[PDB]
Design a binder for this molecule. Structure first.
Ligand SMILES: CCCCCCCCCC(=O)O[C@H](COC(=O)CCCCCCCC)COP(=O)(O)OC[C@@H](O)CO
Ligand SMILES: CCCCCCCCCC(=O)O[C@H](COC(=O)CCCCCCCC)COP(=O)(O)OC[C@@H](O)CO
Ligand SMILES: N#Cc1ccc2[nH]cc(CCCCN3CCN(c4ccc5oc(C(N)=O)cc5c4)CC3)c2c1
Ligand SMILES: N#Cc1ccc2[nH]cc(CCCCN3CCN(c4ccc5oc(C(N)=O)cc5c4)CC3)c2c1
Ligand SMILES: CC(C)CCC[C@@H](C)[C@H]1CC[C@H]2[C@@H]3CC=C4C[C@@H](O)CC[C@]4(C)[C@H]3CC[C@]12C
Ligand SMILES: CC(C)CCC[C@@H](C)[C@H]1CC[C@H]2[C@@H]3CC=C4C[C@@H](O)CC[C@]4(C)[C@H]3CC[C@]12C
Ligand SMILES: CC(C)CCC[C@@H](C)[C@H]1CC[C@H]2[C@@H]3CC=C4C[C@@H](O)CC[C@]4(C)[C@H]3CC[C@]12C
Ligand SMILES: CC(C)CCC[C@@H](C)[C@H]1CC[C@H]2[C@@H]3CC=C4C[C@@H](O)CC[C@]4(C)[C@H]3CC[C@]12C
Ligand SMILES: CC(C)CCC[C@@H](C)[C@H]1CC[C@H]2[C@@H]3CC=C4C[C@@H](O)CC[C@]4(C)[C@H]3CC[C@]12C
Ligand SMILES: CC(C)CCC[C@@H](C)[C@H]1CC[C@H]2[C@@H]3CC=C4C[C@@H](O)CC[C@]4(C)[C@H]3CC[C@]12C
Ligand SMILES: CC(C)CCC[C@@H](C)[C@H]1CC[C@H]2[C@@H]3CC=C4C[C@@H](O)CC[C@]4(C)[C@H]3CC[C@]12C
Ligand SMILES: CC(C)CCC[C@@H](C)[C@H]1CC[C@H]2[C@@H]3CC=C4C[C@@H](O)CC[C@]4(C)[C@H]3CC[C@]12C
Ligand SMILES: CC(C)CCC[C@@H](C)[C@H]1CC[C@H]2[C@@H]3CC=C4C[C@@H](O)CC[C@]4(C)[C@H]3CC[C@]12C
Ligand SMILES: CC(C)CCC[C@@H](C)[C@H]1CC[C@H]2[C@@H]3CC=C4C[C@@H](O)CC[C@]4(C)[C@H]3CC[C@]12C
Ligand SMILES: CC(C)CCC[C@@H](C)[C@H]1CC[C@H]2[C@@H]3CC=C4C[C@@H](O)CC[C@]4(C)[C@H]3CC[C@]12C
Ligand SMILES: CC(C)CCC[C@@H](C)[C@H]1CC[C@H]2[C@@H]3CC=C4C[C@@H](O)CC[C@]4(C)[C@H]3CC[C@]12C
Ligand SMILES: CC(C)CCC[C@@H](C)[C@H]1CC[C@H]2[C@@H]3CC=C4C[C@@H](O)CC[C@]4(C)[C@H]3CC[C@]12C
Ligand SMILES: CC(C)CCC[C@@H](C)[C@H]1CC[C@H]2[C@@H]3CC=C4C[C@@H](O)CC[C@]4(C)[C@H]3CC[C@]12C
Ligand SMILES: CC(C)CCC[C@@H](C)[C@H]1CC[C@H]2[C@@H]3CC=C4C[C@@H](O)CC[C@]4(C)[C@H]3CC[C@]12C
Ligand SMILES: CC(C)CCC[C@@H](C)[C@H]1CC[C@H]2[C@@H]3CC=C4C[C@@H](O)CC[C@]4(C)[C@H]3CC[C@]12C
Lengths: 558, 558
């Protein structure tokens, strides 16, 4: 097996599409710091421990996301589910890239399209804050999401053409610009994964340095804006009534698992190609810290831009922009237009966005391919044809999201395909590793790898804290489910049913695989359970009947 | 390899769902005998020769629909395409079975639902021909498909609930009755195919004798009906202006390939499990003759019932009923209601219909499984799990057809997924067998199998007549494509585009596989072509450069 070298003090999981695209609007939806508090809370007790656990497991088992369950086959279906979940996000992650690519084609012009009105895609209700005599902002200002801004009009009508679709029931025909963009994206992804997984300097060298510089420049220019004070005050304000709710915690947990890459198989695949003596402890600590800092500064800049647009458009910060997946493509272009030499900064920004998106998609596809090739070794000899199959099936399923109303399907996937299912997957993983496999054996493996055992804090998190919190958030997501909306359009009940069915398609993979393993094994019921709970490399112990999982000392070991 | 025994003088391909369900409405659409003439024409020169060719190939190669191209790998993709085409019909063939199953649940009642009006599913516009004082048949009789008949109302509103769907753009939610029916159908199909392919007496013993008796009784009762004369005259009338058209020939060719099972891989799989000394000549002759006779008598009875309903409802025969896939479920129940003891005859009829449908679906699924297991031998050791995968994927894709507007998707599949693609597949097969592989080698194989060479007629058909006619019908289908309609609703252009894309998904499998084989082989371009045109068991000849396909004598051999 090959070993990846090209690894700075902080892995690439710190800066990704989740922190630059998902975290902004996920935080803007849940007020201000009222989303930051649960974010850091689930990061210190759930996110970082599960990150460390997945990294250590991938480094010790030297296997993919699915095969690492050779120590406990009854949870191997979990290794499938997360992979499918990864594929799920691949249905809309590549589309986002396409969006940036389109913005790239809009960045080479001397006059940015999102600067003013008067274009073909713009509607008659287009309010230019810079110069507009017909602007009656002082009046007829509906208390709702302001879509009559040049950036929002260019996003929904020029890029997505949402005005040609009434809802999810009538998506229409896929836009040909987005079609060609997605084709280019999947071609680039195929030409980067077919000949094995190389260092891929093209995207790594960028994502290592350029996103930090771009975020720094954006924050420095935003704090100097006239409306920065209101946005800063809104971002630093703590709304305890939102903490009293339940959706904020679910969103924080989902954003944690998105930014840290836990629950998709990317961490396991990454650790499988690392050195056996690599210290995942310091790596996980630095990754979590830098990811938290990056999310904090990204939300700070986002709220600064929101306050600026609120001061310019004379609208409330709550209703100045949207709360969907296209919030950054409306806020950041407006801030770039204010920058001197908007063309160069826009080009650099959308080039950064493309690099982060391609990096995330490449990591996800590599995780999926590694899992399915470790499960079926034949795919290791046909990686090119296999890579084509994944990228092509992905294109056929990403066509729904590039349609005239594909943003609704994208939101449906981001809310149901990822969410309330990844939490269950990571919960089952933690239960299988700490309780079924044993937290003591995991600590012994970590000691064999790095030379030292984790502290009691990590053990209590892997065994008690994180599983309990995951079960709690899963229960509170199931009992307190809320209807999905694009902040102006309420999804129909059958759309929610389809989303729940898509989530169950990955959730039920664990009991189905349990039943399959129970029926595929030969012997008594107790012998089948022993075969399903003992490692595949120690099945001879089942012949000796010395199964530690059938002893109370195993379950009472911390 | 196992060998099937349970084979009467005429194989089960004579009486099938195509002759009892597809042929009736396909002939009623194309006038009367104006559809019979091209049917027999394509049967004597295209249908029977290709039937004999596929039977002999399956009996000689002892392989599935795809692997029989071991003599010419460049056409092996064709063996895939037909299999996919089979799967295509499996998307709507099982649904038809479900329909009959629902009718079975409607057959145990003492009062048939399709006898009169006054039910929940019936609309206010329900005209009972038996007794109705409000019947003003003498007036307000729109010159269109009469849907205000009890049988049609029970079919479209009681079974399909078509009134709740405006078109293909809004299919709605799948009906739960049809859902349970399709679940029962796929369960029965899985429990009949998992433990290998047995004789399956349950459906074979029925389909051998019961359909003939039921058709005989129906014809005898129909010829005695008062309106039988008009229907007989319409069926025996030859409309030459329809022969001057092009759609009639396409429909006749599609019905021939449906009734004979050519173009789906069922014939190859059937012949692969037969004795090596089995005479496919007499079998093909008797099969074609009995299939033609069965189609003729079925159309005769159908036109008799149409004339009866025209006499009762006082409507023209052209507009007395529909021309869709639900014509038999409207005509035959009306004739059964006139029979003495309608309950028993209805039960026997829908039991026959279920047997034929299950037999056709079992043959198609067995062909698909045999092809995919001969291509990948590993599936021979996991036939149960594989059978589940085919049946389940089939259920997930048949859900579109059991919806409130699933009849539109069913018609789309029956018109595009099967049609203009199966003709291209059988054309490529005939070209690869007669020209690339060699008609002389095929005749030598038939002589080795049966002890005698086919006549010059069969050679000229396999090499000249049938390929030319297939190319002609393919060209006339491509250049003279007509928009699809349910005789009252015109499908939108994007529906036709999706249908053409589904057809191309199977059509382009041949050039894609050609490119794949060319790129996967190592050597010069001429050596790659030689490897792609010579049999896999004679590739050593490529080393000796004595390839007969590179000689003019091979192409000029009859
Ligand atoms: C909502 C429907 C789920 C139906 C799907 C239900 C079959 C259950 C078989 C099953 O669980 O066997 C697995 C292998 O599974 C696979 O292949 C890929 C399966 C991907 C299909 C999931 C599609 C979900 C939308 C595990 O097989 P294994 O025995 O652990 O290993 C096989 C071989 O690699 C050993 O080296
Ligand atoms: C509209 C998209 C077509 C994309 C699909 C394009 C790949 C092309 C590979 C290809 O053509 O390899 C085939 C094997 O193919 C398969 O697997 C099943 C393929 C089924 C996918 C078709 C889905 C169509 C809706 C033939 O492989 P082989 O080299 O002849 O034999 C493999 C092994 O069985 C040898 O014993
Ligand atoms: N879908 C999805 C999804 C969802 C939520 C997510 N959060 C985070 C992600 C993934 C983002 C990180 C991707 N990694 C993988 C690629 N990269 C890397 C570095 C050095 C290397 O070196 C070699 C070599 N020597 O071959 C190869 C090689 C590769 C580092 C970054 C994600 C993805
Ligand atoms: N999809 C589709 C589709 C489309 C268009 C079509 N036209 C025609 C068809 C198929 C209808 C015929 C199916 N055959 C296969 C099953 N049967 C049979 C007889 C004796 C046997 O004996 C054994 C044993 N000893 O194991 C096993 C066994 C099986 C004979 C009938 C079709 C299908
Ligand atoms: C089926 C699995 C294995 C692969 C595909 C998964 C995703 C891409 C599928 C699963 C269910 C699908 C949805 C099911 C139904 C609808 C409603 C329709 O009016 C628009 C498309 C839409 C919204 C589909 C979009 C694509 C979708 C979300
Ligand atoms: C079926 C899959 C595998 C391949 C085909 C994908 C389909 C969905 C895609 C591929 C190319 C696309 C077309 C490309 C360009 C145009 C022109 C535009 O003015 C209307 C939409 C239209 C007509 C698109 C419709 C959707 C389309 C046909
Ligand atoms: C429908 C469209 C998008 C299909 C893809 C078309 C383009 C992108 C394809 C068609 C043929 C392809 C080329 C075929 C062969 C090679 C040689 C290989 O060593 C590197 C890639 C390279 C150079 C490919 C690059 C991508 C390519 C140019
Ligand atoms: C165990 C290995 C070494 C040999 C056996 C190879 C077989 C079992 C492997 C290799 C190719 C694989 C398939 C490739 C493609 C698909 C389509 C999609 O639905 C994902 C799973 C599925 C259905 C895979 C299932 C497992 C598979 C059939
Ligand atoms: C969704 C549809 C349209 C496309 C599906 C593409 C994927 C799932 C399919 C298409 C062709 C398939 C490949 C065909 C043949 C082989 C060679 C065999 O030795 C291992 C499996 C492997 C490598 C298959 C893996 C799965 C595969 C890549
Ligand atoms: C619409 C989107 C999904 C189309 C994507 C097409 C991609 C996946 C296809 C189109 C043509 C293909 C190439 C055609 C030929 C070759 C040369 C061969 O020696 C290696 C593979 C390679 C380089 C193929 C790689 C995959 C490829 C680039
Ligand atoms: C083989 C699998 C992976 C393919 C999955 C993708 C298929 C099911 C998707 C991809 C894009 C989709 C199309 C996108 C847009 C339209 C136009 C709309 O007015 C009717 C539906 C139609 C025509 C869709 C039909 C289904 C479709 C072709
Ligand atoms: C998705 C629907 C069908 C729900 C049921 C899914 C699960 C429970 C079913 C579907 C198909 C089933 C498998 C079908 C056939 C076999 C082979 C047999 O030798 C052992 C049991 C085994 C391996 C079954 C185990 C259970 C199974 C995996
Ligand atoms: C994609 C392949 C491999 C498997 C599925 C094939 C069949 C079942 C698919 C392919 C394209 C599909 C159609 C694409 C688009 C539409 C329009 C939508 O308004 C209703 C469903 C409908 C009419 C789909 C029905 C199912 C369909 C016909
Ligand atoms: C996603 C696949 C694999 C499994 C689920 C299939 C879906 C499409 C099926 C399975 C069961 C179905 C439901 C069964 C019964 C009812 C009640 C009826 O009054 C309205 C429709 C409704 C609510 C159906 C909607 C469609 C449904 C949810
Ligand atoms: C969602 C529904 C339709 C799933 C299927 C449920 C029913 C039909 C399933 C569930 C469990 C199944 C049984 C499980 C095991 C066996 C033993 C085997 O030797 C014969 C079949 C038999 C007896 C199965 C028959 C079908 C069965 C009863
Ligand atoms: C050559 C044999 C002996 C060993 C290799 C087994 C592999 C290559 C076989 C066995 C299982 C197969 C897959 C099973 C399921 C699917 C899903 C569907 O899209 C049809 C093809 C596809 C994708 C098959 C492709 C080929 C496959 C992956
Ligand atoms: C469409 C989706 C929902 C379901 C797809 C089901 C089919 C394509 C998949 C699901 C599970 C798969 C099987 C999983 C594992 C094995 C064992 C391996 O040694 C040969 C292939 C085989 C037997 C696979 C064949 C293809 C398979 C049956
Ligand atoms: C909605 C439809 C598709 C559901 C169909 C479910 C079918 C395919 C599933 C459900 C439960 C399954 C059964 C569960 C358990 C067993 C016992 C095992 O020893 C052999 C397989 C067998 C008998 C399975 C066969 C397949 C099965 C019957
Ligand atoms: C994995 C593959 C084989 C699955 C293919 C089947 C999927 C794509 C089909 C089967 C039945 C379909 C559903 C049937 C009916 C409805 C209700 C409608 O108002 C919106 C779309 C929706 C919710 C469909 C979504 C797509 C669907 C779930
Ligand atoms: C469906 C779209 C992508 C159109 C292109 C399809 C065909 C022409 C493409 C798609 C993927 C391609 C394959 C991808 C990778 C390889 C492996 C390489 O060692 C030989 C060529 C081969 C086997 C390619 C042959 C051409 C190929 C099969």
């Amino acid at each position: 097996r090959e070993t990846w070298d090209f690894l700075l003090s902080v892995v690439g999981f710190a800066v990704d599409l989740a922190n630059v695209w998902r975290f902004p609007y996920l935080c803007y939806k849940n007020g201000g710091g009222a989303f930051l508090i649960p974010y850091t809370l689930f990061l210190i007790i759930a996110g970082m421990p599960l990150f460390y656990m997945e990294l250590a497991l991938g480094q010790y088992n030297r296997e993919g996301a699915a095969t690492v369950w050779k120590i406990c086959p009854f949870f191997k279906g979990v290794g499938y589910a997360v992979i499918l979940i990864a594929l799920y996000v691949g249905f809309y992650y590549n589309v986002i890239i396409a969006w940036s690519l389109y913005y790239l084609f809009s960045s080479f012009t001397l006059n940015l399209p999102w600067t003013d009105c008067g274009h073909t895609w713009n509607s008659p209700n287009c309010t230019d804050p810079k110069l507009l005599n017909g602007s009656v902002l002082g009046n007829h200002t509906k208390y709702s999401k302001y879509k009559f801004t040049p950036a929002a009009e260019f996003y929904e009508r020029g890029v997505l053409h949402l005005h040609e679709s009434s809802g999810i029931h009538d998506i229409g025909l896929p836009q040909w610009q987005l079609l060609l963009c997605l084709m280019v994206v999947v071609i680039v992804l195929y030409f980067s994964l077919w000949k094995g997984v190389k260092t891929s300097g093209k995207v790594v060298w960028i994502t290592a340095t350029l996103p930090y510089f771009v975020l720094f420049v954006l924050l420095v220019h935003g704090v100097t804006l006239p409306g920065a004070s209101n946005g800063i005050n809104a971002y630093l304000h703590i709304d305890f009534y939102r903490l009293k709710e339940a959706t904020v915690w679910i969103d924080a947990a989902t954003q944690i698992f998105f930014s840290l890459g836990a629950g998709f198989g990317v961490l396991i695949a990454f650790a499988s190609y690392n050195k056996f003596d690599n210290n995942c402890y310091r790596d996980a600590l630095l990754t979590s810290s830098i990811n938290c800092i990056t999310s904090f500064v990204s939300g700070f800049a986002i709220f600064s831009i929101l306050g600026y647009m609120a001061h310019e458009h004379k609208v409330n910060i709550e209703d100045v922009a949207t709360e969907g997946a296209g919030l950054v493509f409306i806020l950041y272009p407006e801030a770039i237009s204010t920058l001197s030499g908007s063309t160069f900064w826009a080009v650099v920004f959308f080039v950064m966005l493309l690099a982060l998106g391609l990096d995330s998609s490449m990591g996800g596809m590599e995780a999926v391919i590694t899992g399915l090739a470790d499960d079926f070794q034949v795919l290791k000899r046909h990686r090119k044809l296999f890579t084509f199959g994944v990228t092509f099936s992905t294109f056929l399923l990403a066509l729904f999201c590039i349609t005239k109303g594909g943003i609704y399907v994208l939101t449906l996937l981001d809310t149901f395909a990822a969410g309330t299912s990844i939490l269950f997957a990571v919960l089952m993983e933690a239960i299988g590793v700490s309780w079924f496999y044993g937290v003591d054996r995991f600590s012994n493996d970590i000691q064999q790898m790095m030379g030292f055992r984790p502290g009691l804090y990590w053990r209590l998190c892997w065994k008690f804290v994180s599983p309990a919190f995951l079960l709690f958030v899963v229960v509170v997501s199931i009992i307190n489910f809320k209807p999905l909306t694009y902040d102006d359009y309420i999804f129909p009940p059958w759309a929610n049913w389809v989303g729940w069915g898509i989530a169950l398609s990955s959730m039920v993979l664990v009991p189905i695989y349990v039943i399959y393993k129970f029926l595929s094994t030969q012997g008594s019921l107790w012998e089948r359970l022993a075969y399903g709970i003992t490692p595949e490399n120690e099945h001879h112990l089942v012949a000796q009947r010395d199964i530690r999982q059938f002893q109370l000392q195993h379950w009472l070991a911390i």
